[PDB]
Design a binder for this molecule. Structure first.
Ligand SMILES: NC(=O)c1ccc[n+]([C@@H]2O[C@H](COP(=O)([O-])OP(=O)(O)OC[C@H]3O[C@@H](n4cnc5c(N)ncnc54)[C@H](O)[C@@H]3O)[C@@H](O)[C@H]2O)c1
Ligand SMILES: NC(=O)c1ccc[n+]([C@@H]2O[C@H](COP(=O)([O-])OP(=O)(O)OC[C@H]3O[C@@H](n4cnc5c(N)ncnc54)[C@H](O)[C@@H]3O)[C@@H](O)[C@H]2O)c1
Ligand SMILES: Nc1ncnc2c1ncn2[C@@H]1O[C@H](COP(=O)(O)O)[C@@H](O)[C@H]1O
Ligand SMILES: Nc1ncnc2c1ncn2[C@@H]1O[C@H](COP(=O)(O)O)[C@@H](O)[C@H]1O
Lengths: 76, 824, 828, 76
């Protein structure tokens, strides 16, 4: 199974996963492929924000699905 | 009336290309004919076709656009517009149909060889049609069928351009193209009143009077935006009326009245004694004219307001005129800015204005609420599951929802300080295991305090805390969904602790944002929502009603109706009461969150005070928070269909303008927060109720009797003589008196039995064990009696006298009751 | 097995005194016709012809017979076994009739003396005494036979006893009583004293017992004092030689160092007998220490003072030569009076020896609970609205039945009555009105209920002032049985089926009646009163038993004090209670209880020490009830000294007279827990301090902060437009800051801020500069703001801290600092 | 029927009465013969005080019974 996470800057990042993966896993993947520190990553699917610890299958993100990732930082 | 799709002369690429081709190949090309072939010059730049060039063409197109807009508005108000053969109205023109209309308009005058009017009419429009079909052929790929359905479509619009038979009223295309070109004339022609009234006559049946007034008012704004002179209008002008069809005149002759068959008169026909032409003023005062033209008794100033005749004329010969006549993008930009402005000035004309852009200063209940929040923050021990218990008063769910509903929580936040910020950590401590519930029922409950310390809070000083709080709001949906739902009073199944946390955190969050934001406020923001189909449909209806009852005007001000419908249909509160999340990038709400509703919030006058959320590196949400001021409404000016979401739902974009007016202030009964605070400031006064409690202690008579019984045992047989004379006469009577004094609590007895107690030297005369023992017991009895006579004979009469002075407003005597105590 | 005596006494029987008068008139008062000591002598100028064997001696012998029988009966009642005569009788079985005959014989036993000769004319003198007796009987045959003596053979029996032909001094009760009656007297004459005291003691002791014998000889010394005869001492350590009285002999101790005992037995020695060298006589000291003597005489190691206690030897001799001696020796009535008073006192002195003494005759002073009870009674009286049917409700406390039965049981209601005043008496009329239809019930179930208040108004009360009321109340008590029987039963806690209101009325009116009596009575306290009761035969017999046990265990003594047993039996058997707790009705005329009311029980109450304080009830004309009321003091007991059978009632039941003596002692004090009345009074007087709690209720009222905030807006909107030159620069400059500062002070409760903005409020003269309607409106508003600020600055900055520190100073007992807190308040 | 009222002063008063006579009346008879105002009279029979209003037969006083009379007055 493979999914794509798309960004606001336009780029489409492709990831290898399976549903028993958590989202801890997915942001680690994205960090390995794009150098994106995991605490800066906010992942959204079908409008809903995904939470660390819970798995990919729990949110019913299936094969070829598209997640969206935005950078979210504290100010200052 | 169908919902528009956002198609606009100012953003569609096909129509702009058509204008460029028309400009590149014809207009702006030196006249090959005779009349006014000579170019003219503006600020150094040359324009070859001054009157029928590019600016005129673009204006024609703009007129068609606003004519359809106002037509749709009038059909939504319930007006009956003139019908064609189909039964269609100008209101039924679709976006695609209008694109074809305007594209035809771009070529309607390209076929001119010079500025000759009387003759060569047929020829020039043949050349215009040839130009149009050349353009179609050379872009057949792009144009067909996507713009034009087929070659016969193209021949229909080519036929309207040719205008062989002058079928000006056959279809929407004929009306829009011909009257689009007609409206532009209302510039050069003198006299003004006659021509404006005539052109008004001809547009009026198709869209209605309100709409026609809006068209010509917007028209003068377009003249200003493309550097064309703007005439005045004088209902009382004494020039002679000009009958526009045939350029004739009206007369009256002998008969005081005007000559009627009105009887048309040529200007070449000279007639009888004391017969003269009808003047402009008397033409506009005829009932037939007033019933179809609201120009009677009205006047409009020429030129620009605020501009000197020298300054206005200087602006008319600016190079920007030639830029309008030679630069498609520049001229469309001018027209677009004017068009956008005509949707705002009616709105602010309808409400009272304000000169202050800032939030008002606090009212009494916001101050009190700020104090109550500082105290709760200062002592979180007062938070129970059920209710808050502070200084003996009990505030439950209802009180804090009342604060969220009636206080400007931003103004409240402006009254808190860095110590309240710092106390966030302590309150969190105390709520370590309090569970928050996302509004998503498939989300797990997440302890609050715990999570705050575990994941959010990062040390540092107060500013770091402010950033941490803002981050909690920005990042934790289990928190911000419950908090927002509660603040807007649209929550289901919230715990009291959730309501309280929202009540405490909304002002503190506002303080954090105000203190930490450094950005100058952006003036366009976007906010995304996922609404039910029914609720969205309600909002669309309300917005369309507001828009349809917001119109520019020349003579007839309908601001009162705009005010009425805006207050009936306002949905500002959908963005109120909470720290509302927005982005400067429409793609955050449109693409990332997949909202089916997008509010495009415009704040040109800077009244929203948005504040920056997080950092805004590339790829961030570019988020700002708005806490809507109580007197700002977000008024709709456009509703566009934008396609569909990722889930297949319909998406609409509401464009809203922020408007500040005392008219938008809510009315709230006062006291909801001051009262509880006053209950909290009442003194416990426990040393007084313990003065009362000791004032009701029974005297310990047993001790008294014990001493007299002992005095009896030792007061009967003492071989020593003077010890017994002392014992019977000096001790036993004092115990007598005293025992009765305590018994009746008669203060007269006790106050003087005090003086009868023997001195220490009187007792020192006997050195026996029981004698000293007795002197100690006598001393204790004396303390009892004395304190008792002091209390009931001195202190409590003083306190009663003081009180009686307090209920009589006599404060100085009240203090005197305490300081001037009489002795016994 | 002891029959009840019938009140026969040497001091009241007429026959016995007639015999004594006759004996004196004819023989005793006449000169001695013989030789030895025939010469008359003189006491205070009066002559006595027979000094040693005259009238006083004879009357004393008869007195000895009376006390010997009394103590015999007491001794059989204690369980002692007395010597029997041949018939099987003891001296205890002597009857009143027999004792009269014995006493008449005793009266003549010495009349036959011609002089004081002893050794020679015993036969002749006793023959002449016998002849005197028979002459008297013959001359009075009418009165005396057969009523006193049954016939001439009875008379010859007693004449034979007088003759004493065969010295059969122990044949009968008459022989023992006459001879030892004459013997007991022998004491005054004989020295050495111990020998004689022991011998006579030894001859009486078998017949009545040691306790009884001791009582006889102690009373004997009392009779000696009362008839002006000298009283010797007694010294167990005396070193004089013993006198063997039976034979006027000696006992001797030889050279060897022991008493000469026969083949054992001390042997008699003549005083004329020749004495062996270094042989010596037994001294009294050695005689009283022999084992046989100690086993029969408790005089060993004891010593008794001679003369009268409290009297100098010179004045004792002066008293012995008084004229009263000649009155005793010549006036039968006077001598019998002396003896009667001594005899009566010997029944009282043992009682007072058994208990602690008391010096004061008055009732004690009030205790705590009596003072409190008096106050509660005055309060119920003054405000009768508090009397309900089940309770009294007074000053927030609820007094129920037992509270008032507790007052009736534990307070001296006489002492309580001494604490009431004439206005409580006057308030009786009001109480009676409130109780107009309260129904009282006699304890007699055949009587109908009477309504209290109504009867008071329509039948008892007679107008007048307080004293008249007091008399009317006393008359209600004296005259209305439906009232006093219920009241008495309740007061004595022996009532059945009483209403609450009956109990309350009893509790209120017992002290009020006592006050009426103490206030109105003037008669001197009588010292004999009579109280009649109609008791059941069961209860009366129980009382008879208790009284007889008490009397039988009260005895005089010489050497052996049995006070502890008198204390034990008096506390087991006292029935003082049946005369206690109420205003008990008595009369000075025994015929009122005996004849008018027909009582089967009469208490003869004697009060020689004035401890009962009786008060006159009603009028004391002839034919009246001669009534007095006694309210028995808590520490006074009516101790029985005699029980007499007095005949039968009109209804045929037996009537008895108990003679009781009032005796006061701390031993008779009851113990009662304190507080039964003091407590409720103190709870009534706990003060309701409503002026203090409305001071605090004023201290917790909220300021009108909304008004100050609105006023700031009005100062602002009125400030935007000028009026006076200048008026709005004044508002911006001097008033808007004060309103801000006042608001900030009130938002907190900082008294420092409010105290200084108080001085920042503009003066009245500064406001006098502006004359507009809004200017004056606004000065009115500013005055109100200043009042607000002022009340909070004064209360929270001066008064309430002053009261807090005052409280703290009194809670540390520092009263001086407590007043210091109020008067040394600093200005702001 | 005749009854005797005996006094403390010694006198024996003979009255002829009838069983239905009241006690008021009996005291009136005593007043007529010995001059003692009835308000001063206290009459006793067999230990019991007799009350005005009740008859001689009520107290079972019959022929030749003996009553007792004492004077009873208020003080002062
Ligand atoms: N344009 C945006 O909404 C936007 C922009 C930037 C960042 N975010 C991020 O989204 C999260 C906050 O999302 P949010 O602001 O959409 O949630 P928020 O609490 O408004 O609520 C979101 C949803 O609640 C419902 N809702 C809100 N108001 C309603 C109303 N008045 N009546 C009926 N339903 C209503 C709708 O489903 C709405 O989409 C944060 O991570 C924030 O940073 C959102
Ligand atoms: N009792 C007298 O000797 C006496 C003397 C003078 C006047 N009175 C007159 O008689 C009336 C008062 O009569 P009272 O004093 O007999 O009334 P009371 O209430 O004292 O007693 C009445 C009867 O109650 C019974 N009784 C009283 N105490 C008892 C006890 N403790 N135990 C068992 N039974 C007891 C006896 O029968 C007694 O005679 C008034 O008219 C009074 O003036 C009586
Ligand atoms: N009453 C009218 N209705 C519609 N179009 C008109 C009208 N009058 C003029 N026009 C347009 O303007 C041109 C007429 O200008 P003129 O010939 O100056 O009257 C024609 O080409 C028409 O296209
Ligand atoms: N032991 C005795 N028993 C009885 N009576 C005695 C006794 N001794 C003396 N008397 C009496 O006293 C009289 C004798 O006196 P005298 O002879 O001095 O003892 C005798 O009449 C007796 O009556």
């Amino acid at each position: 199974m493979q999914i794509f996470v798309k960004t606001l800057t336009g780029k489409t990042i492709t990831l290898e996963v399976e549903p028993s993966d958590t989202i801890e896993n997915v942001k680690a993947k994205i960090q390995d492929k794009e150098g994106i520190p995991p605490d800066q990553q906010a992942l959204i699917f079908a409008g809903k924000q995904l939470e660390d610890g819970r798995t990919l299958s729990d949110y019913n993100i299936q094969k070829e699905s598209t997640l969206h990732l935005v950078l979210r930082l504290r100010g200052g | 009336v169908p919902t528009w799709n956002g198609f606009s002369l100012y953003t569609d690429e096909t129509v702009r290309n058509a204008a460029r081709y028309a400009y590149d190949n014809y207009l702006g090309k030196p006249y090959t004919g005779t009349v006014e072939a000579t170019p003219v010059n503006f600020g150094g730049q040359m324009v070859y076709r001054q009157h029928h060039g590019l600016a005129h063409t673009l204006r024609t197109m703009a007129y068609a656009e606003i004519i359809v807009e106002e037509a749709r508005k009038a059909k939504l108000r319930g007006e009956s517009l003139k019908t064609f053969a189909d039964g269609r109205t100008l209101a039924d023109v679709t976006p695609e149909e209008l694109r074809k209309i305007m594209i035809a308009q771009a070529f309607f005058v390209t076929g001119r060889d010079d500025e000759e009017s009387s003759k060569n009419y047929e020829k020039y429009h043949e050349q215009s049609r040839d130009a149009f079909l050349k353009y179609v052929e050379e872009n057949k790929s792009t144009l067909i069928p996507d713009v034009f359905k087929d070659e016969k479509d193209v021949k229909f619009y080519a036929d309207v351009i040719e205008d062989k038979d002058h079928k000006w009223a056959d279809s929407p295309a004929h009306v829009l193209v011909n009257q689009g070109h007609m409206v532009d004339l209302v510039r050069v022609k003198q006299p003004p009143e006659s021509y404006l009234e005539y052109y008004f006559s001809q547009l009026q049946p198709w869209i209605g009077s309100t709409a026609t007034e809006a068209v010509f008012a917007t028209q003068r704004q377009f003249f200003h935006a493309t550097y064309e002179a703007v005439a005045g209008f004088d209902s009382e002008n004494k020039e002679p009326h000009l009958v526009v069809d045939g350029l004739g005149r009206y007369v009256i002759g002998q008969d005081g009245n005007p000559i009627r068959e009105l009887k048309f008169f040529s200007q070449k026909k000279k007639l009888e004694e004391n017969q003269r032409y009808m003047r402009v003023d008397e033409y506009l005062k005829l009932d037939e004219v007033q019933k179809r033209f609201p120009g009677a008794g009205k006047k409009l100033d020429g030129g620009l307001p605020g501009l000197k005749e020298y300054q206005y004329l200087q602006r008319l010969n600016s190079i920007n005129r030639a830029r309008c006549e030679n630069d498609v993008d520049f001229c469309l930009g001018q027209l677009q800015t004017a068009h956008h402005q005509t949707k705002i000035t009616p709105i602010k004309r309808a409400f009272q204005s304000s000169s202050e852009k800032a939030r008002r200063q606090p009212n009494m209940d916001e101050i009190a609420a700020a104090r109550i929040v500082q105290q709760i923050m200062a002592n979180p021990d007062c938070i129970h599951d059920d209710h808050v218990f502070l200084n003996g008063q009990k505030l439950e769910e209802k009180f804090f929802r009342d604060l969220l509903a009636k206080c400007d929580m931003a103004i409240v936040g402006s009254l808190l300080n860095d110590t309240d910020i710092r106390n966030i950590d302590t309150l969190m401590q105390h709520e370590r295991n309090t569970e928050f519930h996302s509004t998503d029922a498939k989300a797990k409950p997440v302890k609050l305090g715990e999570t705050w310390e575990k994941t959010i809070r990062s040390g540092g000083g107060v500013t770091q805390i402010k950033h941490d709080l803002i981050f909690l709001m920005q990042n934790d949906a289990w928190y911000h969904t419950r908090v927002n739902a509660i603040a807007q009073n649209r929550d289901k199944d919230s715990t009291f602790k959730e309501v309280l946390i929202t009540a405490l955190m909304t002002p503190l969050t506002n303080k954090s944002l105000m203190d930490t934001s450094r950005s100058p406020a952006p003036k366009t923001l976007f906010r995304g929502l996922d609404l039910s189909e029914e609720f969205k449909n309600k909002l669309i209806n309300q917005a369309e009603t507001i828009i349809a009852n917001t119109t520019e005007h020349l003579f007839t001000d309908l601001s009162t109706e705009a005010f009425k419908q805006i207050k009936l249909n306002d949905f500002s509160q959908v963005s109120a009461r909470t720290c509302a999340s927005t982005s400067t990038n429409i793609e955050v709400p449109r693409t990332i969150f997949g909202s089916n509703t997008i509010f495009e919030i415009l704040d040109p006058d800077g009244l929203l005070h948005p504040k920056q959320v997080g950092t805004h590196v590339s790829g961030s949400e570019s988020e700002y928070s708005i806490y809507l001021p109580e007197d700002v409404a977000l008024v709709p000016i456009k509703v566009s269909f934008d396609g569909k979401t990722g889930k297949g739902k319909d998406r609409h974009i509401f464009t809203l303008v922020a408007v500040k007016s005392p008219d938008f202030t809510p009315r709230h009964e006062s006291g909801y927060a001051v009262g509880p605070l006053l209950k909290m400031q009442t003194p416990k006064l426990e040393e007084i109720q313990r003065l009362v409690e000791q004032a009701r202690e029974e005297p310990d008579l047993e001790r008294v009797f014990n001493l007299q019984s002992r005095v009896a045992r030792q007061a009967k047989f003492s071989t020593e003589s003077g010890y017994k004379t002392f014992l019977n006469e000096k001790v036993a009577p004092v115990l007598e008196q005293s025992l009765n004094g305590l018994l009746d609590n008669n203060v007269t007895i006790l106050g003087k039995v005090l003086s009868a107690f023997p001195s220490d030297g009187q007792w020192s005369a006997f050195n026996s064990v029981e004698a000293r023992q007795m002197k100690i017991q006598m001393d204790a009895i004396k303390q009892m009696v004395e304190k008792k006579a002091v209390l009931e004979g001195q202190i409590l009469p003083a306190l009663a006298q003081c009180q009686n002075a307090l209920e009589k407003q006599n404060i100085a005597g009240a203090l005197q009751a305490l300081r001037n105590i009489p002795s016994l």
